[PDB]
Amino acid sequence: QNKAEGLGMVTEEGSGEKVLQDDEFTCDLFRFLQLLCEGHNSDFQNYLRTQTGNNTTVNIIISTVDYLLRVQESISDFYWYYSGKDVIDEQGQRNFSKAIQVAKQVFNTLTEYIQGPCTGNQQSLAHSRLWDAVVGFLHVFAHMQMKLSQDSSQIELLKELMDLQKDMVVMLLSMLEGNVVNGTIGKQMVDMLVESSNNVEMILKFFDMFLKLKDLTSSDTFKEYDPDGKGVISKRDFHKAMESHKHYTQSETEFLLSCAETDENETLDYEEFVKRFHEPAKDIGFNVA
Amino acid sequence: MEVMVNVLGGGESKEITFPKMVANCCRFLCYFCRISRQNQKAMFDHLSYLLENSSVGLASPAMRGSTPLDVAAASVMDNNELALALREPDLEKVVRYLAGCGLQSCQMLVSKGYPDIGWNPVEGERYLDFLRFAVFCNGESVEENANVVVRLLIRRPECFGPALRGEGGNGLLAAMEEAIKIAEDPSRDGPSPEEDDTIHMGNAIMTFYSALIDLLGRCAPEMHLIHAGKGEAIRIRSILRSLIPLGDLVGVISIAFQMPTIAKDGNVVEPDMSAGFCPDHKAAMVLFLDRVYGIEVQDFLLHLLEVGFLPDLRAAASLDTAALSATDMALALNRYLCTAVLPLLTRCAPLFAGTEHHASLIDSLLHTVYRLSKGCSLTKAQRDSIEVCLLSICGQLRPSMMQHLLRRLVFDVPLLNEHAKMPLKLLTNHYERCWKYYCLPGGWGNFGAASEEELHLSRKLFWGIFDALSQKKYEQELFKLALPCLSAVAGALPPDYMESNYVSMMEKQSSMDSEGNF
Amino acid sequence: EIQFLRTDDEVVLQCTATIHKEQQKLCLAAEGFGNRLCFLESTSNSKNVPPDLSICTFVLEQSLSVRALQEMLANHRTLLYGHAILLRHSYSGMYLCCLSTSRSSTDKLAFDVGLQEDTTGEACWWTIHPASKQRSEGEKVRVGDDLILVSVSSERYLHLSYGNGSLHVDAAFQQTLWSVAPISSGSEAAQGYLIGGDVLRLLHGHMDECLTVPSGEHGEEQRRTVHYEGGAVSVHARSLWRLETLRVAWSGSHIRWGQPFRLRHVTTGKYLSLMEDKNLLLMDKEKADVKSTAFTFRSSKEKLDVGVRKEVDGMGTSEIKYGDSVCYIQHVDTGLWLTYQSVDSIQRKAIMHHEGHMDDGISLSRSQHEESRTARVIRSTVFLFNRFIRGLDALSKKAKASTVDLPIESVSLSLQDLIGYFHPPDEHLEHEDKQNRLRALKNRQNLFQEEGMINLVLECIDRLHVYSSAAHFADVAGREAGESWKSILNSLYELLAALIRGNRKNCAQFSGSLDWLISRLERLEASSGILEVLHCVL
């Protein structure tokens, strides 16, 4: 489709129904199953996993995580296609948004499957292929959080993906719900973590790199740099404050400078900066902690 | 479509009931696609059905262009949006049908009595035509479809026919020789208990192999991608090179046709085009050569020119008589040359620089091209192709060799007929390029200097054109075009020129003979 | 529980062939020096003929996605289906690849498969795909799982040719299904403990003498006897043995007390065996049956044999340790114990006894990889150069040229490989690395001279000089031999110069043969090489 528009010929579909054929259908299908188990409906939660009366049993819980693995692979491949290219086009942004919405709905459905300490569903998804999907999403999050934050035109994609990460961590917490000492679910989760050591390490560095931004802004050194109520601080002032604070390294300094959008006036608003970065960082960091 | 669906579903096993109306509906759908581009997409929306109902009447001749496979080809024909939106399973179904045709015998023909072979050329040719239309669109090659098709073709090697399949196949050249031998053989060619009654097995085999070669050559990546160095394109091109050896292509090009002849009574005895080696077979070979292997080596170019290209052009020249010109052999030869050979020689124009050691060969090429230009059945576009090719070749052609062409031109260009116009351009550009060769005694050191025979011939050309233009009736375009030529000749001739009072006598009597100069 | 193949794990690729209505189990094999083309080694009848897994083992360096492969070409993780994996041949150190050249066995589409020195390019890389519908893209590749490999460069599958008389492995569009066996994994292998496939020296209880064969001055079938030598032989290639387990899978595991294994002599290629007369004797691979060639390590002389124990899939528990653990070799079937006969250049005969003496303790010392590779290279060179000399002898005896086999291409290729092996270090290299290369080159030259590689080269030079001219050699042998006569003759002299250069002991042993060399200095076809050799010796 991209080559089709590039060659200049008229296209019936602008966004393109060919990629992600039916986005509303999958979302409705998984929202139906999430509503079916909402309210910690343990009876229907167990009946989805094992139909006792029926002659043959279909594991909806396993099929859901299979679809989650497939959509994780699709998202990872789309990321890998877009890794080299500097800027994400509109079609890429729409496809990422639709895929992230679908993944978020699947994670919500899995979370409603596993909440209400449903031990059967928890043990089924423990032995299912959830861990590979989670480790794929962890790498995707580790690399998007570096890439998108540097640019300023994909902030909506960044926040949608950060919400996806929060939902994944809530799903992991619901897995850990009702855990026992030296539990098999915990062992498998730590195996997943040590498998994804580098990705989660990068995510944690990205989180605690922006979690100190509130302290940096509230420091008196920044206050004397910006005594104005309007708060639009100069880029040079913010840059020099970032080493005067003595808690940000040079790499963090240059990364925040790159992640800092500036107007033609060569200045930045620390208020918009912090509300743009810190809040998702705190929200997801609490769940990770 | 619903009428055709009902009839095709009714009694599908026992061939097709009421084949005439099915053919009429397929023709109507093809024409509906051809009417407008949106109708083509509307028909493309149901391309899936035509694929599982492709094997309807492919074996039976006289239904060509009126089968569901033809309707699918028309729906996917020359539409880039449709070619790009074409899916991979749709190509896979056709590839599977081609594999089935390559593995299995043709039950209908062997039932009617045709000799039994292990593969189906008549269906395979149609299935290869559909793949050609799927992969190739508007001069360019759709890389996405071409890579999928070539990958499926190499995953199923049985699609290549017994010769190129690889279990001890005799090779492309051997297969072509055996097919012609079958063609002259009456027993193997026909069932032996007008054309639809007797499908010629040799022609089926040659058309199958030429269609496979044509499809692979069209699937070859574009040269711009090769220059960019894209690894997938390099891989596909190397795979095609491995699939088809260059020597087999050279041999098939070297194979000669059978020229028509008149009989004892003098009546033209013309072998039927439905039985024999077609120029389109060589046209596919040339296309594969130029798109896959690439023509960039000078000695290779001249070797191919001698072995396969020049004999065919000389045969076309010898079959330029007015009675034999109207024969469809001559038309097919002119079509093949002007579509493949002359464009290839025009693209190979820079390589024609170092041809001193093959002066006889290059002079023979010039003479044959000129004789084909001096023709009647030659169409307007064919004349254009001849003009461009000859003007390109004579451009980089070294002035030493073309004095044969000059000495034959100085006798027939003074006529100032419409056939003299491209000699006029040729002389104009040649003298403009080789101005300092003639005027300056030293000239180019590598080229040398005039032998004074060229100088005398240029004197004769100047005087003949000058006189014939005075005696010539007014045509303002003719005086536009003859002006630069006359001026270039006058400038090239050194003002202090010595016309030898002792000229050479007893010249080539064939040159003055206007009946073909032979 | 199911294991998964990871990077840096050593594996063996197996293929199944039902030749003549009987199923055979084959393995992908390749030899570093000499023929680079891969060949298949049968492992079905391991009972009567031992398998040579040493040249069949491959290690999985890197597993990467196809797009990552594209990016790295433009400018421990478990194996997952769909990745592109890189295989390094364990012995040679080269990488498996498509050679882009074919033997043209009426399969013009197929491409031959061999080894490549450099990993650069997409030829070395191969992609693993699911064999059946149970497997799927992206999931972990289980151990003991059948796999199909796809060439990245040529898009040709690893194929086993059935139609030809001799089975060949090549890259063809048809699919041959390959199973993967975990031969070993050095990631969790404890250092200092004996594992299968090692090359070791059997040291007698006086930790001074090795279990060695007669030296290289004695001819073949006089080297078949087994005895004890001490002193300089401990640092030679005639004291090296390889412990080969009777199991194909997991043959690199730690050796347990009582595990049956075969001891193969590295330099000769023969297997230790027990003859019916209770006398130890080296005996050939073809007749190397399990019954004759089976020996076990026992911690104590006490007679309570372990009997039968279940085999464990993996490294297992490390029991035998190098240099400290005392091992007593006993034959499995006969039950006798290895001991010194104590006959009355020590030449302590090794004999096979029901009871034996008390000081039968045998220590184990691990041999370096460089020395093991040098010994294997020596064995291969011995085989190839003996074939060459026998062919030349037949040609001299006037046997028909077609009947006689003359390894023209293989001898030349092995000669260039040996030149590369004995190439002196370059000067721009760092000092410590240069000193290490000098030490390695000196060790290689010493091992070659101790195995007597000089005399073989001298014999080849003489039997090539019996033909005066290239035209004369082309009249006697084939025309290709005629063209290769100059190249092989020059390469042999260059090899001799490389073997003698910088080695005072080798140049001293070459003093006797100097007079032979100077007698042909007048010959123009070898004057430069003869003069270079003379200069080095002087």
Swiss-Prot record, chain B:
Q: As annotated in Swiss-Prot or TrEMBL, what is the tissue specificity of this protein?
A: Detected in heart muscle (at protein level). Heart muscle, brain (cerebellum and hippocampus) and placenta.
The record's function comment reads: Cytosolic calcium-activated calcium channel that mediates the release of Ca(2+) from the sarcoplasmic reticulum into the cytosol and thereby plays a key role in triggering cardiac muscle contraction. Aberrant channel activation can lead to cardiac arrhythmia. In cardiac myocytes, calcium release is triggered by increased Ca(2+) cytosolic levels due to activation of the L-type calcium channel CACNA1C. The calcium channel activity is modulated by formation of heterotetramers with RYR3. Required for cellular calcium ion homeostasis. Required for embryonic heart development.
Phosphoserine, modified sites: S514
Q: What is the lineage of its organism?
A: Eukaryota, Metazoa, Chordata, Craniata, Vertebrata
Source organism of this protein record: Homo sapiens (Human)
Induction info = By TGFB1.
Q: Which residues of the full protein are shown?
A: 2172 to 2701 of 4967
Description of post-translational modifications: Channel activity is modulated by phosphorylation. Phosphorylation is increased in failing heart, leading to calcium leaks and increased cytoplasmic Ca(2+) levels.
Q: Could you describe the subunit structure of this protein?
A: Homotetramer. Can also form heterotetramers with RYR1 and RYR3. Interacts with FKBP1A and FKBP1B; these interactions may stabilize the channel in its closed state and prevent Ca(2+) leaks. Interacts with CALM and S100A1; these interactions regulate channel activity. Identified in a complex composed of RYR2, FKBP1B, PKA catalytic subunit, PRKAR2A, AKAP6, and the protein phosphatases PP2A and PP1. Interacts directly with FKBP1B, PKA, PP1 and PP2A. Interacts with SELENON. In cardiac muscles, identified in a complex, composed of FSD2, CMYA5 and RYR2.
Please state the pathology the record ties to this protein.
Ventricular tachycardia, catecholaminergic polymorphic, 1, with or without atrial dysfunction and/or dilated cardiomyopathy: An arrhythmogenic disorder characterized by stress-induced, bidirectional ventricular tachycardia that may degenerate into cardiac arrest and cause sudden death. Patients present with recurrent syncope, seizures, or sudden death after physical activity or emotional stress. CPVT1 inheritance is autosomal dominant. Ventricular arrhythmias due to cardiac ryanodine receptor calcium release deficiency syndrome: An autosomal dominant arrhythmogenic disorder characterized by syncope, cardiac arrest and/or sudden unexpected death, often in association with physical exertion or acute emotional stress. Patients who survive manifest polymorphic ventricular tachycardia and ventricular fibrillation. Unlike typical catecholaminergic ventricular tachycardia, arrhythmias are not reproducible on exercise stress testing or adrenaline challenge.
Compartment(s) of residence:
Sarcoplasmic reticulum membrane
| Protein name according to UniProt | Ryanodine receptor 2
